[PDB]
Symmetry: C2
Subunit: 118 residues, 2 copies
């Protein structure tokens, strides 16, 4: 399976990439909203882990435009952990919303749960 | 022309109703998100003035669901006046975003501007 990780922090992106690779996923990466959209169209990932906060396009905006054409599962990841953040991510199309810092094992479990249902 | 005013404060709703009536619009009112959606389907207004903050459904959620079926112009009205509020209202489908308190004459000008282009 192919995962697109859209994250503007190279350290966090690498931790997720390393852990998804170890689980046997193919990983493509993007570091802003524009790259996320390009990688999305070109690579057709099975799932996208999307930071809400990105340099070019926000995460909310990326997920909005994705949902125009695609039902690809989106797992939103963010340091913002209030009700309003989670609810607005889910309502703008996230299938799930996990907060940072996260548990590596939980992330993996949640990715598998999204792919199981999809 | 018919305006639906979705506002949970009966005092503000009345001021907008009074002023739109004086301009020759037919007015229907709604005081929460559920009533907005019901009035929307039943009355088919030409334009909707929508408070962002409502008891049942938020304004963002109402405008989201409206846009599923309809291109009816939406003018979002709110006490929240930050960039993030305006931008997220516009991006969730508002044609315009005016802040409270507002100028009666400006509201009217902006309503006419939305109807002119529509
Ligand atoms: Mg990345
Ligand atoms: Mg009202
Ligand atoms: Xe957005
Ligand atoms: Xe929303």
């Amino acid at each position: 399976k192919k995962i697109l990780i859209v994250d503007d922090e190279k350290p966090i992106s690498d931790i997720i990439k390393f852990n998804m690779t170890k689980e046997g996923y193919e990983v493509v990466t993007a570091f802003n909203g524009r790259e996320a959209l390009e990688q999305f169209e070109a690579e057709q990932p099975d799932i996208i882990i999307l930071d809400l906060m990105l340099p070019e396009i926000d995460g909310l905006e990326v997920a909005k435009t994705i949902r125009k054409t695609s039902s690809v599962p989106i797992l939103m990841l963010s340091a913002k952990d209030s009700e309003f953040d989670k609810v607005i991510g889910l309502e703008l199309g996230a299938d799930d919303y996990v907060t940072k810092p996260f548990s590596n094992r939980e992330l993996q479990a949640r990715v598998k749960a999204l792919l199981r249902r999809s």
